[PDB]
């Protein structure tokens, strides 16, 4: 579908993009209704009024989990003695299959700057950090230039717009770990420590970065904020007739005709995304599987392609919506090799804190290597299944290992024939010792 008319009413995030894929700087951004929501927020709205406005707009988190943003902002302490607060932008985006934040920050940096400004004013957060991955050189350059332009234009720094709100925005480039995207591990990596996640409670809203109240939000959530405050609650609730309010960046990748990213309302079915926007599979390819929201989501089949891309609709199907960036797997891809690659990523991106991930993902990796080489033995599939069952939520310290075992569980559930075809050798981990008769178990 080339005929995409990106009006600001239906495409609040991508209507001011440019055809040559060039970044929109401060003059062009303010020409196309820039910092209107920030002006309204900082000249005619209380911070609690903004928090309640975002809560009434129903803005959920765009970083995969779908937690409500207004409820997260309302969990900040009501003490007036805690005024050293921090806002963090999770620009890490280390999940395989996820490329939305790169587009948003390379081409519209001032949208992120305005969203950080509005969210910091709502949270009464004196300081803001953009935790960005180190592989995004152009996004870092564009964000630093946008921050410099907003600072010289009076939109950042001391006494913004004459209200008296002081806000300083920094860009922190990471050093390449997938676990750094997890918000408590993100806080640990921001503090100059090893990025081990933290147990919750306490949540970062009460004790976050350097012990202060801290709110971590994804890039796309903070890009959703300025349109909410520039158009209103009823406009954000009246663009989609679904329980998930607002629009979402969705797109199919991998052996499709037009891989890319498009802004679509919630409740859009995955089949029409794949057929109209992605163009379907390429020539001589048969669609066999797909992942809805990145490497940490369960595989779904052709029958699940008709489901709307919502949190609850895909949650009921045995998966989760995730980042809503789907990946298509054709019939030429062996599922054992694909899950082997996924589990190698998840095993080597472990942080090493807790036993089941650290010592059970490598066992699953070695089993999958054996099944890919055809050297599988009986009990390997049962071992994979009990690794899936014992790496679920609550068994491990953070959510990295449940997201690791979701593709393994789904692929064993659907494409079990390949995993059973990997097994060719009899089971043996004990060799013969010359003078000792073995205990011949049955």
């Amino acid at each position: 579908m080339k005929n995409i008319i990106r009006t600001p009413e239906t495409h609040p995030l991508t209507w001011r993009l440019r055809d040559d894929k060039q970044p929109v700087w401060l003059d062009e951004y303010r020409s196309k209704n820039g910092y209107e929501g920030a002006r309204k927020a900082l000249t005619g709205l209380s911070p609690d009024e903004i928090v309640n406005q975002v809560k009434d707009a129903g803005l959920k988190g765009r970083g995969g989990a779908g937690f409500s943003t207004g409820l997260k902002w309302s969990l900040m302490p009501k003490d007036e003695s805690m005024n050293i607060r921090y806002l963090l932008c999770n620009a890490d985006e280390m999940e395989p299959g996820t490329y939305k934040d790169r587009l948003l920050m390379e081409q519209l940096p001032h949208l992120l700057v305005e969203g950080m400004l509005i969210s910091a004013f709502a949270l009464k957060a004196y300081r803001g950090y953009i935790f960005l991955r180190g592989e995004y050189i152009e996004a870092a350059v564009n964000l630093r230039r946008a921050i410099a332009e907003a600072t010289e234009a009076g939109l950042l720094g001391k006494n913004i717009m004459g209200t008296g709100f002081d806000f300083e925005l920094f860009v922190h480039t990471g050093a390449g770990r997938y676990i750094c995207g997890e918000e408590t591990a993100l806080i640990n990596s921001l503090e100059g420590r090893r990025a081990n996640p933290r147990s919750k409670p306490p949540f970062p809203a009460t004790s976050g970065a350097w012990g202060k109240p801290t709110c971590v939000n994804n890039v796309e959530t903070l890009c959703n904020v300025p349109a909410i405050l520039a158009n209103g609650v009823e406009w954000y609730q009246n663009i989609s007739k679904s329980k998930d309010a607002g629009t979402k960046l969705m797109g199919f990748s991998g052996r499709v005709k037009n891989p890319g990213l498009w802004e679509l309302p919630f409740g859009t079915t995955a089949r029409e995304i794949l057929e109209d926007y992605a163009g379907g599979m390429r020539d001589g390819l048969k669609f066999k599987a797909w992942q809805p929201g990145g490497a940490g989501t369960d595989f779904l089949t052709e029958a699940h392609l008709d489901l709307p891309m919502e949190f609850e609709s895909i949650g009921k199907a045995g998966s989760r919506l995730g980042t809503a960036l789907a990946m298509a797997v054709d019939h030429e891809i062996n599922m054992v090799s694909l899950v082997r690659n996924l589990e190698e990523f998840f095993a080597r991106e472990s942080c090493g804190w807790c036993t089941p991930c650290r010592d059970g993902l490598p066992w699953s990796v070695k089993i999958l290597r054996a099944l890919e080489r055809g050297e599988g033995q009986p009990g390997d599939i049962e071992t994979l299944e009990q690794l899936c069952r014992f790496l679920g939520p609550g068994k491990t310290f953070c959510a990295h290992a449940p997201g690791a075992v979701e593709p393994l569980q789904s692929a064993i559930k659907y494409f079990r024939e390949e995993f059973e075809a990997g097994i060719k050798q009899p089971f043996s981990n004990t060799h013969l010792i010359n003078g000792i008769q073995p205990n011949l178990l049955k």
């Binding site: 985006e93 280390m94 999940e95 395989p96 299959g97 996820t98 490329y99 934040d101 790169r102 991955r133 180190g134 592989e135 995004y136 050189i137 920094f170 922190h172 480039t173 990471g174 050093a175 390449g176 770990r177 997938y178 990596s189 921001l190 503090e191 100059g192 420590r193 090893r194 990025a195 350097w210 797109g251 990748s253 991998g254 052996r255 891989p259 890319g260 990213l261 490497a295 960036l325 990946m327 298509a328 797997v329 054709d330 891809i333 090799s337 694909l338 690659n341 996924l342 190698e344 990523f345 991106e349 942080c351």
Partner: protein, 156 residues
């Protein structure tokens, strides 16, 4: 054996100004030393620790936790080819085989000339244009195995 230059120390202190705690500039200090010297040598750990006022074991734990902070010497150009699932579907194995045939090295090793270091990196966040490669600061997408012996020849 190691001594921080004046520009390195000034950049490290400037990064220390941006945080509540001077410990929070450890990753930036390691990246500054790596940018100036190609990698982080052994004396640099104690130098960074002495500047930041944190123990050298904390600096070493940070430097060995993060894969982009190099702790062994590397080549002049670090090839970082993507390894994740979407580039697996788009065929990164042909790219890896082409790189290993052209450079005659396994991943994680350096050529005898000291020109290239081959590394399998994580997902580069460019999955719709896969397979992806990242030489020192440049991302190259839409890779084909026949374009490698031309792509590698403009990094002298």
């Amino acid at each position: 054996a190691f001594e921080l230059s004046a520009a390195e120390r000034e950049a490290i202190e400037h990064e220390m100004h941006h945080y509540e705690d001077p410990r929070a500039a450890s990753i930036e200090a390691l990246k500054i030393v790596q940018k100036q010297r190609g990698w982080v040598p052994d004396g640099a750990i104690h130098a960074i620790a002495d500047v930041l006022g944190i123990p050298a074991s904390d600096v070493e734990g940070v430097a060995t936790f993060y894969s982009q902070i190099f702790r062994q010497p590397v080549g002049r150009h670090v090839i970082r080819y993507c390894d994740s699932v979407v580039c697996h579907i788009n065929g990164y194995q042909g790219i890896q085989a082409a790189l290993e045939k052209k450079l005659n090295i396994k991943p994680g090793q350096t050529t005898f000339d000291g020109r290239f270091t081959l590394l399998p990196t994580c997902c580069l966040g460019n999955c719709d244009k896969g397979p992806n490669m990242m030489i020192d600061e440049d991302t190259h997408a839409h890779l084909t195995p026949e374009a490698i012996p031309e792509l590698l020849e403009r990094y002298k």
